[PDB]
Structure formats: structure tokens, C-alpha cells
Amino acid sequence: SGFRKMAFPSGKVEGCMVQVTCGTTTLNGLWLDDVVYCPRHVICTSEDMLNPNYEDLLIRKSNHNFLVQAGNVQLRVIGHSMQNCVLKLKVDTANPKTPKYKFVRIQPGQTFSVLACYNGSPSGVYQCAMRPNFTIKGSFLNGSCGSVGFNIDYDCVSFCYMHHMELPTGVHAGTDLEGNFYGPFVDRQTAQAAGTDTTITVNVLAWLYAAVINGDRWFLNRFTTTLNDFNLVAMKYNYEPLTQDHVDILGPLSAQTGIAVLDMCASLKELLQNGMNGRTILGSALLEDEFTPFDVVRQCSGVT
Amino acid sequence: SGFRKMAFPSGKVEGCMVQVTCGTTTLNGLWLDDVVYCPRHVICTSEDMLNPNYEDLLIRKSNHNFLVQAGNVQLRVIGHSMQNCVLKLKVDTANPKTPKYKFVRIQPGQTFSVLACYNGSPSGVYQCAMRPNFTIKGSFLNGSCGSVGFNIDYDCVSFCYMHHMELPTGVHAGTDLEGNFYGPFVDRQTAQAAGTDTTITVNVLAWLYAAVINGDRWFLNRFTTTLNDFNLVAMKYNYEPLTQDHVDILGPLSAQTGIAVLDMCASLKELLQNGMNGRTILGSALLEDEFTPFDVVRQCSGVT
Ligand SMILES: Cc1ccncc1CC(=O)Nc1cccc2c1CNCC2
Ligand SMILES: Cc1ccncc1CC(=O)Nc1cccc2c1CNCC2
User: Fold this and answer.
1) Given the residues B38, B145, B160, B265, the one annotated as active site
2) Beta carbons of B36 and B29 less than 8 angstroms apart
3) A283–B139 C-beta distance less than 8 A
């Protein structure tokens, strides 16, 4: 029992972190096989930041300008290419610690672990969700760029995020491992609107099921609702509309607890309309949306 | 910017996890050098649980009865001994992945990361605090016993906790790595009173400083207080009394922000007396006490 905001064990990812320096800029790279992936803004100086012409800046660089260091050893760079907002530095040595891996583009509302790094060294690990507006609320300081987000399925690490930028609002933006930004963001030092965010309804319901499984049941009520009625409430409270696909994904948790999804929706409806009245659920005084239904089942079943 | 409940990178600890089986019981062990540490209750059956005579149960066991498996390879057990509530299984092979390590007994109110494991395999990592009453609010299922808590200082892992038990209340109890329980707990299947818990005042103030550093400042007020006046409020709200040692530990955060510790105490006093009024601080609707002043500085400075 107990329910925590659990991250994946970061070991397989720690073995891939390297430091990449170009000119006077240092950030993190991800070394998989004989390629090191890092944000392309490593080639920028301070004057470039506002409106960089990455193609021109990269043309002034040669393989020997990209200093890649894996802990204490130096990697020899034999190729460089830009793919969207990432640089791919071909090195002459395959990473001996390369785990089984995939590059994936996650959907908004999905969760992943971040291994925050500075100078190629891991500092900490935390779990977060990709917001519906494609930002993440991380913990990143200057030098953390190139830190990655990932999920693990037994022995396979699916890398889904590489950190690039902190928006003026203090929220974070980045790319998939092919260098495509999540959201409308560009790698420029400029104010950039992040869309209106919403609460991930299916995740809140998953977390309410986790609460019931772990003994927090005070919020269960005598009511039910419909998808239409619940969605009128979700609209008013800036929650994502619930669909039958979301109900279907909540099926295993509904079966385990015996609480029909629409009955849990009626509990969530009452919590939205009345608040918590100074009470808590799983140690939180707000409705938590950073656990997917898959996360709840995994944590509640002890998947390793 | 941003502030997260960050765990240490778990890689150095993942390399030490093994599975220990004795009879029909399987749990986790920690393999450091040529010794495997695990909870002594691995030698119990279901009838033993209520009042085990561990000395007698251990006498019926021989080295070959303790099956230790590190991933896919079997370790040869050449010695066994019980030290308090832990068993130490001497093996013929030193763990090649043994990091630099220490065994430490942490103080209540201090924080650490837990690498939850099942069958010797890591499932997830999370950060928590040792409560003032010596329990931890973890996320542990049957089979997680032997999972450990730790802190990391550059390359040295200080192991501070080994998981043993879930109390009937759903909170967790365990030992230091010498097998001494934190708190009054015994490794028996019985109802055991956990003392009255309190909120870790110095940690809440550290987290309020983290909030100010990261932009959440609405709670700052025009007031100040004294240690005596603040402690009358801490008493009423079940908070640990603040001492000059706690004020001194908050010195670096007070210096960085320019907010005197007693002025932050007056902000905390107003939050205790009036609540949050439906507002949030660092994404929380309650006063968070699982970050020490050291954690706040480490996260805010990017220590790797
Ligand atoms: C300060 C910080 C904190 C947390 N996470 C990231 C950062 C740095 C950042 O946003 N860098 C950046 C992002 C887009 C483009 C460029 C840069 C840097 N100059 C080159 C052009
Ligand atoms: C079920 C669970 C969930 C989370 N964490 C731990 C557990 C198991 C547990 O409390 N075991 C235990 C703790 C003290 C003593 C003994 C045992 C087992 N039998 C032997 C004597």
C-alpha cells in the first residue's frame, strides 16, 4: 500500500549521459550506439540566442569543435548532422552501456521520467506528465539542456523527450529524439505562447481509483453521471473532455475496484463542484493528474 | 526554474539489488562487496509471522538454503549471520558493481530516495522523508522487503534504510543497514503504535524559500514573529518546535533570498492560521515537508 509519484529506475539512462561542449557552451548529450544526440542550440553564443540561423552557425563548425566527454573519457567525433532541433554527433565508439531502446513521440497527457543532468552528470530523477498544451512542469536550470525523458518496459528504454528550453513563464519545452518540438515552440530566446492548458481527466480518474485501492475512499458518493453531463462539468473546470476511449482505458481499474467509471466520474464531479473541504486524497489537497491508468496499475501491481 | 520531488539517480543502487529466497519466501537483498544484506524475516513462513523466534528459525537454515540470484546469475553463499533484524549472507564473489558506500543512520525529518524492488528487480524510485515518528509513507507491496533508501554525495551512496514492514495503518517501517529498526517497531505481524507524528517545520520553511526562489511569492507578508511566538503556533498545529539550529540550517536560503528566517516563520504562521484560501505553492495545496534545506539548495544549484 501507499502511492507515490514514482519515477523509472534511471540506471540504464545514466549510462548514456555525456557532456557536449561547442565553443563556450556546455550541455548534455545522450550517447546511444555510436551517436550522441544533443540540442542544436549547443552551437549558439549569447548574441545568437534571439534569432539563430542554425544552418549558418553549424556550417562554421567541424567535427573537432564538438567536445564530447563520457565521464572522464573523450569521444572522437567523426560526423555531425542536424535533424530538426537536434544534433547527431557520430562518434568512433559505440556506447558499451547502450540499453535496448526506442525513440517514441509521446501523446499529451502521457507521463515519463526525467533524468536531470548538468555537465553530463545525473543530478536527479522525477516523474512528470506531458501537459495537454505540450509543455512540461519540470525542474531544470541552465546547463540541464539535453537531459532526457523516458519510459521503461522491462529492458527497453523508450526515450520520448530531450530538454531544450525554459519559456519566460518558467515552464519547459523540448523535443522528441528526432528533434521535433512538442508544441508550437521554437528554439529561440523569445516569448512564446503555450496554449491554454487543461487538467488530464483520465489521469485524475486513474488516481481516484489508486486512492480507493489504497484506502482513501471518503470522496465516493451515492451518485452517478453520464459522459455528457460529466463533460459539461469538465468544460466549466478546464478538464479534458472524457471519451469512451478514456473509459475503456480505465476498464482494468474499474474491474479491480468494482466502481463503474461513470460512478467515479460522479465522485470527480462532486469534488470539482465542492472542492476537498480541507481534506486530502493520497497526501494531496488537489486533484492529481500526473498518473496515467497504466501508471496506477503498474504501481499497484509491482511491475519491474 | 521549477521545483520537483526529485530522487537521486538510482543507477549505483540498481547494480546492488539481488533476489534472496529462503524456503518459500522471496524478497530483495543488497549486495555490497562479498555480503548480501536482507531482512531477517526472509526465514519466516506464514505461521511464524505472528511471534517468530528468529534465533531458532535461523538455526534450521544452512548456507545452501539461502538462494541469492543477481539478475540471472547465482551467488554461492559461504556464510550467514543475523545482526539485529538483518541477515548478512557472505558470498564468494564481491559485487563488481559495488559503488563507494557508507551505512548511515538518518535522523527523523531527513529525506532519502527509495528504490522499490520486487524479486531483485528495480521497479521505481521516489523521494520521501523519515517522519518524526520514524515511519515512512512509501509505496511498497508484498515482495518489496529489502528495498533500500539512500542518499548520494558525488560518488558515495549512503544507505540509510532497508524496508521491512507495512503496519496495519498502511505506513512503512524498516531498519538502518545494521538491522536496527527506526522507531519502536518489531518485525512481528502485530498492531504496533507509531507515535504521534508532526510536520517537519524546518522542511516546510525550506520549501517556502524554494517557492520564493521559483516565483511563488503570494504568501510573503508584512509580518515578522519570534521563535517563541512561532512555536506557540507550531504547537497548536502539530508542527515540530523550531530551534536556533533549524534557523542556522536555513541561513543559506535566508541569505540567497534576503528573507529573514523569522519573517518566513511569520508567513508560515499566517498560512497555518488562515490556510491557502484555495491557492497553491509550487503546485501543492498543502504545506510540503519532504524537502530539507539541503535538498532545496541542491536542487536550486544543480549539484550532480
Ligand atoms: C536557463 C534555462 C533553464 C532551464 N532550462 C533551460 C534553460 C536554457 C534555455 O532555455 N536555453 C535556450 C533555449 C532555446 C534556445 C536557446 C537557448 C540558449 N541560447 C541559445 C538559444
Ligand atoms: C505486505 C507488505 C506490504 C508492504 N511492505 C511490506 C509488506 C510485508 C510485511 O509487512 N512483512 C513482514 C513484516 C514484519 C514481519 C514479518 C513479515 C512477513 N512475514 C514474516 C514476519
Assistant:
1) B145
2) yes
3) no
